[PDB]
Known about the structure:
- This protein is mainly α and about 1600 residues long.
- Among the domains are: about 5-200, Alpha-Beta Plaits (2-Layer Sandwich), CATH 3.30.70.2640; about 260-280 and about 545-675 and about 1240-1255, no CATH class; about 285-485 and about 495-540, no CATH class; about 865-950, no CATH class; about 1260-1310 and about 1320-1415 and about 1430-1605, no CATH class.
- It is built from 59 helices and 32 strands.
- A five-stranded antiparallel sheet has the order 6-9-10-12-13. Strands 5-15-24 form a three-stranded antiparallel sheet, sandwiched between helices.
- Helix 11 (about 260-270) packs antiparallel against helix 22, helix 22 (about 630-645) runs antiparallel to helix 23 (about 655-670) and helix 35 packs parallel to helix 43 (about 1160-1180).
- The longest helix has 22 residues, at about 1160-1180.
- The protein is globular and about 105 Å long.
- The N and C termini lie far apart (about 85 Å).
- It is classed as viral protein.
- The entry lists the keywords Polymerase, viral protein.
Amino acid sequence: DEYVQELKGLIRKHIPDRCEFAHQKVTFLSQVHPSPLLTEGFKLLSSLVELESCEAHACQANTDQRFVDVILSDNGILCPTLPKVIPDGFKLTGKTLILLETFVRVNPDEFEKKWKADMSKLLNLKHDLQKSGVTLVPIVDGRSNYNNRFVADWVIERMRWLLIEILKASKSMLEDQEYQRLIHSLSNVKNQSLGLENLEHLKRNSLDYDERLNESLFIGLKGDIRESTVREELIKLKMWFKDEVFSKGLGKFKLTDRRELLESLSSLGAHLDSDVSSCPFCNNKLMEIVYNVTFSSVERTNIEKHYLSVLSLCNKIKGLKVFNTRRNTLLFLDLIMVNLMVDISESCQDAIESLRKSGLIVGQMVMLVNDRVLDILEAIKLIRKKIGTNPNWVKNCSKILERSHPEIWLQLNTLIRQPDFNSLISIAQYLVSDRPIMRYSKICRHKLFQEMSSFEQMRLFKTLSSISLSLINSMKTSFSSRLLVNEFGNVRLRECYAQRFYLAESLVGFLFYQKTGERSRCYSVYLSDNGVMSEQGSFYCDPKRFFLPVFSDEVLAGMCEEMTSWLDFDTGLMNDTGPILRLLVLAILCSPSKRNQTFLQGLRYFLMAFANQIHHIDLISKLVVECKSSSEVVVQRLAVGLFIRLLGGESDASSFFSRRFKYLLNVSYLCHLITKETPDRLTDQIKCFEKFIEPKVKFGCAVVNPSLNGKLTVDQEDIMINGLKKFFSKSLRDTEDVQTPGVCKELLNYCVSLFNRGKLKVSGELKNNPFRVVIPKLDELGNILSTYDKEKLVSACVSSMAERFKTKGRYNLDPESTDYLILKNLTSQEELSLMYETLTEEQVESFNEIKYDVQVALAKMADNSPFGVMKEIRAEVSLHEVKDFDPDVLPSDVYKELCDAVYKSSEKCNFFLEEVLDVCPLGLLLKNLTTSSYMEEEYFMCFKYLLIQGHFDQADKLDKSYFTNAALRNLCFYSEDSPTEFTSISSNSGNLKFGLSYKEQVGSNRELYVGDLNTKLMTRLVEDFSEAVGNSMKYTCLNSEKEFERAICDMKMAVNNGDLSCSYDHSKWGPTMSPALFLALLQMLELRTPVDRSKIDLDSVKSILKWHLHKVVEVPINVAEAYCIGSLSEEFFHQTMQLSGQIPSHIMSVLDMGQGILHNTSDLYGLITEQFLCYALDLLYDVIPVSYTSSDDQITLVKTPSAAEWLEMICFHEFLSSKLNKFVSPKSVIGTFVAEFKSRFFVMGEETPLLTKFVSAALHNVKCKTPTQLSETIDTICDQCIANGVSTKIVARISKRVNQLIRYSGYGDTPFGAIEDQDVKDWVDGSRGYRLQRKIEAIFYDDKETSFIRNCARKVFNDIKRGRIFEENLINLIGRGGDEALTGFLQYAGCSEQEVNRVLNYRWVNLSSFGDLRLVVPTLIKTLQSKLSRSSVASGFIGFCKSMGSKCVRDGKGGFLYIKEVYSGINVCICEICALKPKIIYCNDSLNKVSQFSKPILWDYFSLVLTNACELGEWVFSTVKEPQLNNQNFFWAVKPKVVRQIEDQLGMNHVLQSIRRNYPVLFDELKFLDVCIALDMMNENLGIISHLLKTRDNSVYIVKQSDCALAHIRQS
């Protein structure tokens, strides 16, 4: 108490500006007493930051610190039976209110677990307070520190720095486990250095239960089983086995009997059980339509562009919502469109027939704005309807397209042009064909597919790609887009959403459907030869899955001819297998599902089995799944029959077995062409959770809700410990009950004690010892909105608009500024839709209800007849109203559609209004907003409005002043639930909060659990602990490349020796193991670092994995609420209801292993136990295997003296390795001909290319920023694809595919763009710098206009190398811009000015010229701050072809424009300069209007020759030379041969050399490297440094010999 007199005068600089300081300081001065001084003398800061966070927001400070129900009852309000919690600030008027908290942390660690508990605390009030007639916006004040205004941030740290002795002095002078937590609460901005010593500085209190955990856990271990006693028992165990259970048949292997499994396959796949046909097109509904189109159409205009132009004009004017309601905003421009249609009928004699029946309209059909086929006659009604409803209508709505509008409107008269309907009747009854029809829910003639020539076989896939693109841009339709008529097995088609596609110059096709969005529609495909319609089928599928083949006709064609070309030896057999494989590819392309996918992946297991000589005996028992349709059988007869076609011939059909295996394997990986998406989300997450919990509860460890930090009840603990001791039971010599997870703890003692002795290949060495914001809920993961965001941003925008109208008294809402703030902070009509269209349908229907409930939560602010009985109110209205408790989440099958018409159609009173009033002031929306969908055609949303409308919404205190457990929350920064004395089973704070997620792998969904922050904070130390372990280990590869490479090489040279090697995997490696197994492993580890030859301490390691042992895996709500309505887990959760009927949310278990959570800790277990099993085999079977493990895959390479008769050994390995719950998968294969390791199949004499995986990989993962970066992605993946020795021609065909993906997207083209076509060598010698060089200098083919600028490249580069400086400061000649840099260069080289003339009109049009293609700095900075700082493939592409038609291209002038407008700034300059490449290269006079986008190509060509001199070269200057035979498929491994002249280890050599280049660029954020750190400072698209800080990644390339001597050369 030496500062207690100073402590009064210290906060004497706090003037009582309010009541929050006056009474608080007059009670501060009236007693010198240290006993409440840490409480009463410190609560002034508990008043200050409280009031300040209340001083910021709209807040009336209740200094009483009281509850929710009496603050509602201070006015005249009956108390609504609220639960009572504590807020500290209100704003209560109207019929809504504001509860607010404040929480402040410097750590990221429990700053989030406070907000989670806070919003959970006020959102267990949403069940009860919303029913009172009042909503609330529970707002929080997240703070990293103390941001106060009534103090100037200078005395609060004196309050933490001078009181930091006074609690030490008082706790000496005078609470104990509320002493150091006050220390941990009063910390500054900590660099709180947490290592493995993190557990050491807590208390370690216990539970008086963990003794039984150890008593269940550490008994059978001694770590002291002698190495002679291991051999003695293990020899007798082998002698026990070899007479025990090998010969009586409980093994798992056989000799495969290679003939017999062929028959097993024939009975497996060739479904003689099925009712399926032979010709496949009869069976599936889409192949019907394909074979219709390609053999009803292969045997076989200024008004065009005018109609298309004015149609796109209608699309542009439609995206406004400026017709004050959402129904006329289609129909007035429909009137415009049909007026132009009759004006086209009034244009020529043959106008609406000869170029329109062959055009965009067919018989009784009109095409217009969105994609709407409208089928003319209805519009003849509708305008008659609309002029029926408003007789005086086209008087204001026409020149509202001029006034309050851009007024750029190219319409001749069609605005006010109320047409003669009789004139429209003339065209309408002129042409009528059959109306389109759609089908829900025998005969056969399809030319027997292989009875055709090979030429029309691509005409198949062209129609496939044409209908595929139609399915693609089916998505491109707007996602709300509600039509004009609502409302079944066979439906006459009134007006449909309908895409298009060409086929030839006359006949085009369509695609008919009704539902908007992403989900499955019921399609219908009609052709029109010359106007004559034809239905040609009606199928059912889902759009977002056919993103693959959109132009891959040449791509699949290249592989369907390429793979077929592997049979150059059996010509007629090749002539058989060719066409069937192409139809096979078609059928797989026809049917994406999970079943056909998983099957076709599952064929390599059989193929490795027939290739090798031993399988696991249960593989064919699981190599089929049940066909849910008749469609899965179609693929399951052909490749299966193809297996039958060339595995077992009646003669010796194993001749060229290597090509056979390669071929059929690439057939089997041709599975992977199905886009891995698990066709729906809610049937995936339940399937993933059933994959999660079924072996668990079969092993029997399901418990219900823990306390989430620590303590348990007795009974849940009992089944916990029951599973624990049942786990380790599993004796060393029982052969039954072996498929149960666990281990003989005493055989674990053999393994770990022989490990402690240094006779394994690994030991306890342990070099360099390991001892060194928006947050969601947990029950909806796999999605992209939490529930807490969906109240967070709602409350933010609600409180923001709560401010704007009570400054002056506006008292009105803006119906688009209520849609502007949310559209800003999540992702002015054009300013909204400028980035509003950059969303997803999941995001669209979320944003709609966000619009809804923000409009509701602002409609609640100004708030201060059921006798129209149609149906029973107690059976339709109020019964469903109380079953739902919400008018909002009302379903659609409990009612019908017409009751949403008729009871919604109640007559007008003060419940409705007319003259819809798009001003819309607040508080009157109860009659104003309700008529918005009454005057739209829709019925559901107004029904929700009308049912939510009309009130259907119904001294001890001085000692406990020092805050103990009875007084925790009375501060905010008291740091309540930090660890203070950590639990034996928990971290004292959380209990390892996890959730559910899948991964979408090829066959099965690999899982992931949802970590919290502290859970990951503990996960990191354990996984990097094992990382430092496995670095000292010798036979792991989860992160090491080198040992994996040596495993590869010795694997190959074992296979070339003709030696034997296994290949495993592990069925349910994830859900099997438990943390306590790994604790028991860690118990008998010595871990003697060679620093200190001594057993290290593991109590920070052993007691932290106890917390993993008791983890909280949550449940998805989508697996929880799907089980609510009415599959053994679905059976199990319904008997969790007949217990204590809480919903099973929090679930803890024993044996979990999040995959990638404790992964490497299993890897050392999966290393050491593997080497232990490997160790016996040198003494039990006198052979030397070597076993690698990548923590989920394993391999043992067997060395045999002087043939598979030692299967005696082999399943015995299983019989050993099954005992340690590393269960041998039924998918494993062991033999001597084919060995894997992670899809690297190392067969005799060669190596498997595995073509179609990478080929599929390029045709997937087309994600979208820029056609540099997007075409950098497929540039990368083409580097990977040609690493495997595919060809060159496939690569260019992929390049042409992605080129056409650009070209369809409306970017147009550029010689940067996609990479080149026909690239023959460039992959081998060099990165993108040489590829863009070849692409650009193949344009200048005569090699006379660009050899000059490469001469300039030599005259610059040989002066800018060593030996001479010669302006190494070129730093500012370049950075001025594009042209004038090159003008300095070219005169610097030595020539005339005439070259500077003749070159610099070579121009191209850049669209990310000045900035980017904005679809929401030089990118060099981003690559450096990426490397230096350390929604499918279809569904982005639609937001890519939509956010390219927007307002996108920028000038340096502030503002944006369109791509076609830049292409409207064009001319034609036929003299040899524009005419070099059409719409690619320009004259300057061809762009004399807009030449500022006309950047020069030759500047970037010069910079490319310098980058080709940077990253490699001194041959890249030279002339492209002339090449000048072998087997076509004699492919082999070639080497890079790159001559690099830079200096290596660049990672600091460029970052420090950004200062020497441009100062503010790194101020806010060698000999040669800096001159091309300078060739990407000013521009963006060279590709320089990114592939010199990272590496080429392959260096080993294999290619065909016909891609080497056929390739060019560029010698110096």
